[PDB]
């Protein structure tokens, strides 16, 4: 896994092809490493297999990484990183 702090390089946005992408700047030691990601519905219930990107990696300290997700409709929460360093972003996807 990857245990360093993560931060947003560019806020999550919708893509031309019906996904969402967020750029995260890895600020920690131990790269390269797996970016911890987890998508939870409004009930904090892990929404499954909606990370379109191949298992995302941080390349080096202060390396930005594009992550593409297919969030569920309605409210969702994207937890990046692990522990108290973890980022929680909110996303709402409209039906159209």
């Amino acid at each position, epitope marked *: 896994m990857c245990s360093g702090k993560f931060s947003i390089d560019k806020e999550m946005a919708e893509t031309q092809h019906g996904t969402t*992408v967020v750029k995260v700047k890895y600020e920690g030691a131990g790269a390269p490493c797996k970016v911890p990601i987890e998508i939870r519905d409004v009930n904090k219930e892990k929404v499954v297999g909606r990370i379109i990107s191949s298992t995302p990696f941080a390349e080096y300290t202060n390396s930005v990484t594009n992550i593409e997700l297919e969030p569920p409709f309605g409210d969702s929460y994207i937890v990046i990183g692990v522990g108290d360093s973890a980022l929680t972003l909110h996303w709402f996807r409209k039906h159209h």
Partner: antibody
Amino acid sequence: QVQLQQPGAEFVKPGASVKMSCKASGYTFTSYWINWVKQRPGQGLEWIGDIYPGRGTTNYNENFKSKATLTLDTSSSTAYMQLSSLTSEDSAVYYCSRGSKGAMDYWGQGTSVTVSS
Amino acid sequence: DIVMSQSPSSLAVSVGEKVTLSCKSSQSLLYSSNQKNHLAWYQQKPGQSPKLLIYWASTRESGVPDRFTGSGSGTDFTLTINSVKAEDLAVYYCQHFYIYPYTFGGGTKLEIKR
């Protein structure tokens, strides 16, 4: 009808930059994405990046991250791309296209860039 | 990145003859959420900009004659032209939009046989 209008050609020296326009008409400009695509004379197509009119969202191919810049002018319904630190490798035709869900359903005629001293 | 491979690289076909072109993806282009294959075909006539023929693998763009048909799923796609016309000479490309960055196949040069 749907139309994308680009300048025919640009001639510039190495090390310099260039900016080219893509003027849209025939549809509501803020409802569609615009892509940019590179084609070397005898080669295929290469996606540079896209931009969404209105929100201003941009996405780049990592290959062109330090080379290309995508911008807009919503009033003139125009999109622009700038290429920097030019070399002969950048000599190519550059199309803009309208994107419908990832498909490029309309195209400009292309701007042919020659980089030479 | 995703890799789009097209074969043959070139072929010659007569007016009225049928022809099949292939496009394989290095990974699936299928969204299980809506069973949509994120793949498109384009026709680029000599000295002209590319033109969209099909999207989502099987869906014809408006204005395109029905003799152009898209087929396939997952990673194996094909574009068939039956009753090839003389004006159909061009380079046909496939493109994915499964994920950024979009990448195109090497293309297939369609020569006309007279």
